[model samples]
Target: MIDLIVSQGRVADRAAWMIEGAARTARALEERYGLKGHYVGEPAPHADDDWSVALPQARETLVAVREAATESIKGDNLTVLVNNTCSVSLATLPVVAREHPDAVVLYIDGHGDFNTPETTDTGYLGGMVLSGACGLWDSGHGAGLRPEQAVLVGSRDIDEGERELIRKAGVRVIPPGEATAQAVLDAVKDAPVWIHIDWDVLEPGSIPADYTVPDGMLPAQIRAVFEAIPAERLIGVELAELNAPADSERAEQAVAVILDMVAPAFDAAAAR
Candidate 1:
């Protein structure tokens, strides 16, 4: 079974759009898969400058996700968490660790999201997600994910600080074109996998996201990567960072693109 958790947490900016986009995507997923969703925290106001201002609500959102993930595991279902930002991984990854201690994390994003509080130049919480989850720095959320269990794919806009940390931690990073199924499979060595996608990992014009890098994986390439994972070993998937465009048609197009990209995983989960 697929259990959906829709949350709008810690919107750095574009709170309204991100919130709307997450809802829209969640609705479409529910319709596409014929599943009901567990909706989480309300959208707090935008906090572009001070990340701390959003912590209380962000913590609540993570706690809710953690609880839902626990229930999903208890029921032997796959958890599908759709949220506005990647920061939720700070919570979700740990839950996966506790439930499936040997699972590897397949983190696909445009940015490395591996910065520490000390190494981050922008002080953005999203950039620090993987690092925090790996216990590189304290995010106040619990962390049990080891660096060796992380396989980063399609991250092109990595900060210098993040690069250093990533190297030191020995986290495997598969660049854009090289993220074939075989490559990803090799990285994880066929371990059970938890997949996370930040929508900006796609080519800029193909999707709506706040952060865009110059060259990214095409939609087909991402689908191919998703298809590579063995369905039975697929623990769950989470999607984030989709900032909906103001145009309704464009937003719908973006949602459709995302649904298509994630089809392989969803199909595999359903078959099981």
Candidate 2:
């Protein structure tokens, strides 16, 4: 069985899309990999949220993810999907590091999410998550992953400060389509890594989400990257920020696309 941890970032205490998207993806993953999904965490109604709320919620989810991370034994893998990108995904990094210290993170997103309160013009927590992971700024959340170990790929939309921090911290930020599977292998070297993907990382047409961005990486490009990464090196996986699609049919289709893209990684993990 695969441990599927679904946590809604609840950044806005928004709507049903995040959880449902996760549930839908869970079904798709089961069908594609034939591994039963043992779910953790309850998907509840959005009660409306802001920074004060999202912060503690993020902390709580980390503890849950930590437990789920412990479930990976041999070939069985853990799949985490945060309804929104809002930085909550960073909660899992510290948990992975306690037992697997050398693990890196392959953060695939459209925005850098590296801004600090002082530098973020928009003040979005999602923008500062990577920075917080690197311990660049303390936003009540402790630094989880180091900068050198955090690999940001498919990032085209970024704040000036986020860009500066990424460079200064020595985090490897690769533009969309400019990177290959071998390049990712070279970057990770021998360290195990948690693969984090934000929905906006895909081009507008691949997966229709509200946060869709232009000039993004194609689905095949992403597949190549995942396929290139050896399964044994993947410590865990997290997917976030999929706004609901048009209907159930659309949702299933979207999940199919996503599952196909990451199938190699999952297949590799299960086979081992």
Candidate 3:
């Protein structure tokens, strides 16, 4: 659980929105929705993240979660691991999956980041995430996990190499163009699932952050998919790449919707 993470400047500058939003989401979950033990405030250098500071924050948060998990109980074989930001998100799959074999990841982002540094058209770090996560680059040391364990949800921009890698990896990619949310929910209905949703995946209307795709799933549909996962099967859920420079109202809406989805599962947890 992460309530705050290290980031660049205290103010929302350079690219600190991801860290800020991660903190915001964590706070909302704990204060309003009864989730605790989540800590999300730290200040790390901004070099890794184009002066963003999310990577160091993420690393620190991961250490904390690992420590806490020693005492926490998420079951024997599976544990929920949420990836709500991109600072070091593309790099954590191996660590999480290694800690828990047979782990599953539900990557929810507007774009399909399956390109390697050499193959990517744009130099954006996010673009290389998928390939790295698949362990295709760095001689399979970085993400360090089997690609088959990840379920890529809301992937719209499938490039040539990306398509090839996705096919070879046997990763289930739920493109917004082809699959509906219900279909997605049905696909990963069973087994442990890790959900990673980039808020920018939402269309301009639902959650128009600083950066967003044109179209996205309806909130109800996202909620439906989220609810389908049992509490035990839920590794973790993440809402990544969010920017709230406009108003708190927008931020509230984003956190509110996520909480609504998560609360039901915790409710199930309480029942246990």
Q: By lDDT, is 2 or 3 better?
A: 2
Candidate lDDT (C-alpha), each: 0.81, 0.69, 0.56
Can you write out model 3's per-residue Cα lDDT over 2-99, one digit (the tens) per residue?
Answer: 22222222211235455556666666755763555344335443333432233333455545544444333334322223333453455455555666
Error of 3 at 225 (Å): 0.7
Supply every candidate's count of residue pairs whose N, Cα or C atoms clash at under 3 angstroms.
0, 2, 15
Worst 10 residues of 3 by lDDT: 4-13
Between prediction 2 and prediction 3, the one with superior TM-score is 2
Which candidate wins on lDDT? 1
Highest TM-score among the candidates is held by which one?
Answer: 1
Off by over 4 Å in 3: 1-16, 44-84, 139-142, 206-214
Per-residue error (Å), model 3, residue 82: 7.0
lDDT of 1 at 240: 90
Estimate candidate 2's RMSD in Å: 4.0
lDDT of 1 at 207: 48
Error in Å for residue 149 of model 1? 0.4
